[PDB]
Amino acid sequence: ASGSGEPREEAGALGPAWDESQLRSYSFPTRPIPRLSQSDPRAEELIENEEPVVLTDTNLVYPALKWDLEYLQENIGNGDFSVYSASTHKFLYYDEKKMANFQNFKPRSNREEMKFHEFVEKLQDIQQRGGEERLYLQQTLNDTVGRKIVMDFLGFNWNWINKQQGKRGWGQLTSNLLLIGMEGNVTPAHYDEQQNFFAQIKGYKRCILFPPDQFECLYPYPVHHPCDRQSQVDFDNPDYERFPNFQNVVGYETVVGPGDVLYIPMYWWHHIESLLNGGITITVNFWYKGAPTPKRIEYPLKAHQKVAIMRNIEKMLGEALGNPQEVGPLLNTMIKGRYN
């Protein structure tokens, strides 16, 4: 019905940031992710318990809030940027290394390296031409990046995020992923194995999250499939015959805007959509390797540990059988008439 709640009113009486007609319609109920300040101890407790929370005042990417297409085009440099195209609004991602195991499936969102000015050229053409094609720039930011953007990076609130890394016992910061998308772009539900600080910069993104214990309801692809860690369920046209427990899924929902930081806990499903008719969206992700597994295991196992266990079983069988395609039949032989 309404998970994000009523839209926030922007300062200076500039009206509603968004309205619900910019959100896509789905079949499952949702509830709000808490919007808190970083000074609120409840926000600290949520991150500690690995629950999602939107922090409204970290100033994490404060110097990046002036970023738009033309400022980035003149300052980001002339490196290569990964640009993904799609004939539809859903951008299904593929592990290209795993595309050898599954030949009978074809990709529908091809990557293309290009210069940043070529991406801005390619985008504005689509708007004048009026085409239905969509693009999504998704590029880890390196040091081939120009002077002013390095200075902007230096202006990030490293004090706040470094102590978050320390107090949680997390591993190191693995990468910063810059993301520029078109309105209506959708990133279908999937989970990551790293802790994520999701720093919104330009435009608005509706984030629908599912806790790890709803693994049964979301049906991820086989670990060896190129779409590993993504849900097989089409949120627009869910197949309740193949995926009956998707009728039981309950999400956590929020809309992040400029200055907001969404903590996506490790192994939490998330479905991200750039608001319809909301313009371009800009986001920077912060990935941290999770804290190492504790000394002695505490029982019962947390849900994300069972997910980790299930991933390792699928990997092990893939190596033991010499062919990832035999994992399925072996698993069915194991349970049919014995555990089901």
Ligand X SMILES: CC(C)(NC(=O)c1c(O)c2ccccc2n(OCc2cscn2)c1=O)C(=O)O
Q: Which residues bind ligand X (CB under 6 A)?
A: 93, 138, 179, 187, 192, 270, 272, 283, 285
The nearest distance, CB 272 to ligand X, in angstroms, is 3
- Return d(Cα 301, Cα 103) in angstroms, integer: 36
Q: How far is CA 176 from CA 142, 143, 197, in A?
A: 8, 11, 10
Q: Which is nearer to ligand X, 97 or 295 (CB)?
A: 97
Say whether 190 counts as a known binding-site residue: yes
The nearest distance, CB 285 to ligand X, in angstroms, is 6
Q: Are 55 and 37 in contact (CB under 8 A)?
A: yes
Q: Which is nearer to ligand X, 291 or 331 (CB)?
A: 291
Say whether 270 counts as a known binding-site residue: yes
Site for Zn ion in 203-242 (CB under 5 A): none
The nearest distance, CB 234 to ligand X, in angstroms, is 17
In a 13 Å sphere around the CA of 224, the CA atoms on its Cβ side amount to 19
Say whether 106 counts as a known binding-site residue: no
Say whether 195 counts as a known binding-site residue: no
Question: What are the tokens at 264?
Answer: 């996506």
Q: Which is nearer to ligand X, 55 or 179 (CB)?
A: 179
Q: Are 92 and 225 in contact (CB under 8 A)?
A: no
Q: Which is nearer to Zn ion, 156 or 269 (CB)?
A: 269
Which of 123, 183, 178, 187 is closest to 152 using CA atoms? 178
The nearest distance, CB 111 to ligand X, in angstroms, is 9
Say whether 165 counts as a known binding-site residue: no
Q: What count of other Cβ atoms lies within 10 Å of the Cβ of residue 161? A: 19
For residue 333, give the 3-state DSSP assignment. Answer: helix
- Return d(Cα 217, Cα 307) in angstroms, integer: 13
- Could you say which of ligand X, Zn ion, none residue 138 binds, taking C-beta under 5 to 8 angstroms by partner kind? ligand X
The nearest distance, CB 192 to Zn ion, in angstroms, is 4
Question: What are the tokens at 235?
Answer: 């949120």
Say whether 202 counts as a known binding-site residue: no
Say whether 173 counts as a known binding-site residue: yes
Say whether 95 counts as a known binding-site residue: no
Radius of gyration of the chain (CA): 21
The nearest distance, CB 273 to ligand X, in angstroms, is 8
Q: Which is nearer to ligand X, 58 or 138 (CB)?
A: 138
Residues 6+ away with beta carbon under 8 Å from 293: none
Q: Are 83 and 112 in contact (CB under 8 A)?
A: yes
Q: What count of other Cβ atoms lies within 10 Å of the Cβ of residue 142? A: 11
Which of 266, 271, 253 is closest to 304 using CA atoms? 266
Tell me which residue has its CB nearest to ligand X: 272
Site for Zn ion in 151-210 (CB under 5 A): 192
Binding positions are: 136, 143, 172-174, 187, 190, 192-194, 196, 205, 229-230, 270, 285, 291, 312
- Summarize as ranges the residues that interact with Zn ion (CB under 5 A): 192
Residues marked as binding for substrate? 143, 172-174, 192-194, 229-230, 291, 312
Binding-site residues from annotation for 2-oxoglutarate = 136, 187, 196, 205, 285
